[PDB]
Each structure stands twice: as structure tokens, then as C-alpha cells.
């Protein structure tokens with residue numbers, strides 16, 4: 001669903017701004033995570049973190065610990081996926097907004 | 110480590126959701142609270158939470174920890 005992707009895109013941009021965090025200087029990383037989140041939301045119903053391996057994705061979504069934004073991000077601003085980075089992170093850029101085309105360049109592959 | 114146990118944060122744990130420190134870095138080390146839950150699974154199904162020990166402190170504040178970050182009081 002394209003509306004799901006756009007929704008996830010909007011979520012990421014707004015959450016970054018709200019938490020004073022920034023996207024990776026390499027937006028291709030950002031794009032991969034956002035699309036992954038969107039895919040999980042479409043399949044599981046929740047934006048389960050896409051950069052992890054699960055023994056039971058359905059149970060994970062029910063528990064909610066890894067539903068984006070996850071507990072480590074909400075509490076410690078720790079984002080394993082490298083989606084939301086603090087200003088002092090060596091890989092953080094100056095953007096809190098990503099082009100829709102960039103996201104779709106990932107969708108095709 | 111069980112629900113109900115009284116624990117103290119014995120490691121550096123910096124959070125941003127503390128009531129009197131919302132959106133700003135705050136180290137919980139030294140704070141004492143009670144274990145509210147241990148997220149090892151959901152209704153019998155194994156889950157992979159990496160901060161399974163949910164501890165509740167006063168001021169209507171709670172946070173998650175790894176077993177090694179807290180100590181029984």
C-alpha cells in the first residue's frame with residue numbers, strides 16, 4: 001500500500017522533529033527502514049522494528065516492545081535501525097524530511 | 110529476579126521520559142523501585158525484548174532494564 005508508506009514516512013519525519021533527532025546522512029538507510037516499517041504494518045498491523053529477527057512476530061506485536069518507536073528509542077533514544085539519530089551521532093545528517101522518490105526507489109527493489 | 114522484588118539501579122541508565130526531566134537526558138542510577146514485570150514472553154510465546162525488567166518508581170514513572178542494570182535491595 002502506497003498510502004501506508006506515505007503514512008510511515010510522515011510518522012518518521014514528525015517523530016524525528018518531536019524528539020530532536022535526525023535521519024542518517026545516507027538517506028538510503030533511512031529509506032530502507034521506513035519501507036520495512038511500512039511492510040510490517042501492512043502484514044502484522046503494527047510497525048514492528050524491521051531490523052530484527054523474531055521467533056514469533058505476532059507475539060512481538062502483541063507485547064509491543066519492538067513496535068516503532070520501540071521502548072529503547074522512547075526511553076533511551078536508542079535506535080538500532082539508524083532511523084532516528086541524535087545530533088552527536090557520527091552518522092546523523094541535517095535532514096528530518098526525506099523525498100518520497102527516495103522511498104519509492106527502494107520499493108522497486 | 111521476580112515481580113515484586115525491590116531493586117536499585119546499579120548501572121548508568123540515561124532516559125528521556127522522566128516526569129521532571131521530560132525530553133532531556135537523565136541518569137536513573139541510584140533510584141530504587143519495584144519490579145512490575147519481566148517480559149520474557151507473551152501468553153507463553155517467547156518475545157525478544159532486550160530490556161525485559163520493567164521497574165516502577167514513584168512519581169508515576171517506570172522504565173525498562175536489562176537484568177544486569179539493577180540489583181535486589
Ligand SMILES: *C1=CC(=O)N(CC)C1=O
Pocket residue numbers: 028029030032033050051080081082
Ligand atoms: C536497515 C536495517 C538496519 O539495521 N540498518 C542500518 C544498517 C538498515 O539500513
Ligand code: SF4
Pocket residue numbers: 033048049050051066067068069070071073078079080081082083084
Ligand atoms: S530501532 Fe526502534 S525506533 Fe528505531 S526504527 Fe527500529 S523500531 Fe523504530
